[PDB]
Design a protein around this ligand. Structure first.
Ligand code: ZN
Ligand code: ZN
Lengths: 274, 274
């Protein structure tokens, strides 16, 4: 019969699970105040209103990028390292790493808050890339992210110092393949003893169908606004769904885990640079 | 001490080698009359003169493609299936396949003559893609190659029937990753007992460094205009170089192999559609 949140907490506590793979989406970054560009309200959205996008996903299409690189660079200025901080949901993942439980964190987010929260690059897979580095679109010359920062904060399109091509951050656009580290899923997912899914809608391949690559006796815990993707329509009976606000889902799990005080103290220290 | 062409012929004949991996470049297609676009002389080159390319490789760069897709489409009209035929060097590979010797054929060419010569898709790796299929650059909708043919032969840029984006043939441009089948090299190259290199200059990664992934006792035979890439500057002592015209290198190998008459008869039949 169906496990509960509490049961999952118990498995971790009894050390019956020691190898947790986590998959995260945009839902875990909302509480850091990161605006959804598709949504009116934010100043990111307003600044986008002047380009008259035919539809918002154009921001992540190459043909539209080479026609006009500024819509996308408005977004990058908004999301570039230093502007936003990790939320509790990030530090809970960090805590999970420092207690020996993290096999691998797969993120679809490009805001960079997982590494900012101090989880090591070797445990992360940024499936949609990162602003930490960039590539010249013409000569394929690689640059660290801070080399084009002055350009991005001043609203100039970054140009290549060798060939003058437009330097693009290593974010995955539509139809581009995921980065090579995404191939870890092949070892990682058969090896997982627990699967944690947080703040995602499972609408972007091939990351979506990943929920399907764990052994059938592996419990899959979803903390998300609703039931969705693989888990809604191919239910396994070790599936668990904490529906509601992601942060209140994480706070309850954290408490059932017995980690509350240690978490508060970790976040105070960490979020200290504010 | 150093093997000779003749020795390699003997290894194959004594059935001491039965698992040949082949890597090929533009050098094997010249004799079918396929023009080098970088080179004055051809009518491909003349037709390119009107676009005033800043340099010829622009034909294979995305930023230049989205700025002007016609230079590239001039090339595609030139190379589209049906216009050119395989040469003897292709049918020698085909013969090598029909005698049970081909583990895998890796090609950097995009002219399609390996499959036209009748070597099965399962034995081929088109490392630089193919005109057999295409993808809409905006909505990533896939199409067979013949769906955009009327457009390419008439000099219209092919547009997507669903979103109107420009449909691009699935050729690998600069900085794009190689196709997924390129991952076969991981099983294929440790498994090879002979490595055959034909008509290439080994100047395009990561295909170039592949010459390095065979076991050290695996003879590497080069039939090419000159000594080059890995083989020129990290010589192993089972290396062999037939320098000269690629076709005369292949004809000599074919004769040492004992296959001349069977080859002529295969080519007459095959090249029959002319
Ligand atoms: Zn450049
Ligand atoms: Zn389309």
């Amino acid at each position: 019969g169906k496990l509960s949140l509490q049961d999952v907490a118990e498995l971790i506590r009894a050390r019956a699970c020691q190898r947790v793979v986590v998959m995260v989406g945009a839902g875990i970054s909302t509480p850091s105040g990161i605006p959804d560009f598709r949504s009116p309200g934010s100043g990111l959205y307003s600044n986008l209103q002047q380009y008259d996008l035919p539809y918002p996903e154009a921001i992540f299409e190459l043909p539209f990028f080479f026609h006009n690189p500024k819509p996308f660079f408005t977004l990058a200025k908004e999301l570039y390292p230093g502007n936003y901080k990790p939320n509790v949901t990030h530090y809970f993942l960090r805590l999970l790493h420092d207690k020996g439980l993290l096999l691998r964190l797969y993120t679809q987010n490009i805001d960079g808050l997982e590494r900012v929260s101090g989880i090591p690059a070797s445990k992360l897979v940024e499936a949609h890339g990162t602003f930490a580095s960039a590539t010249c679109t013409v000569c394929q010359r690689p640059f660290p992210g801070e080399d084009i920062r002055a350009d991005v904060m001043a609203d100039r399109v970054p140009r290549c110092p060798v060939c003058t091509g437009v330097v693009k951050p290593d974010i995955v656009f539509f139809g581009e393949p995921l980065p090579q580290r995404f191939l870890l899923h092949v070892v990682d997912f058969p090896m997982a003893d627990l699967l944690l899914i947080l703040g995602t809608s499972l609408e972007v391949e091939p990351f979506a169908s990943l929920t399907e690559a764990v052994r059938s006796s592996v419990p899959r815990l979803l903390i998300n606004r609703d039931l969705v993707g693989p888990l809604a329509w191919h239910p396994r009976s070790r599936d668990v769904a904490q529906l509601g606000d992601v942060v209140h889902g994480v706070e309850s799990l954290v408490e059932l885990l017995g980690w509350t005080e240690e978490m508060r103290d970790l976040v105070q220290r960490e979020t200290g640079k504010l």
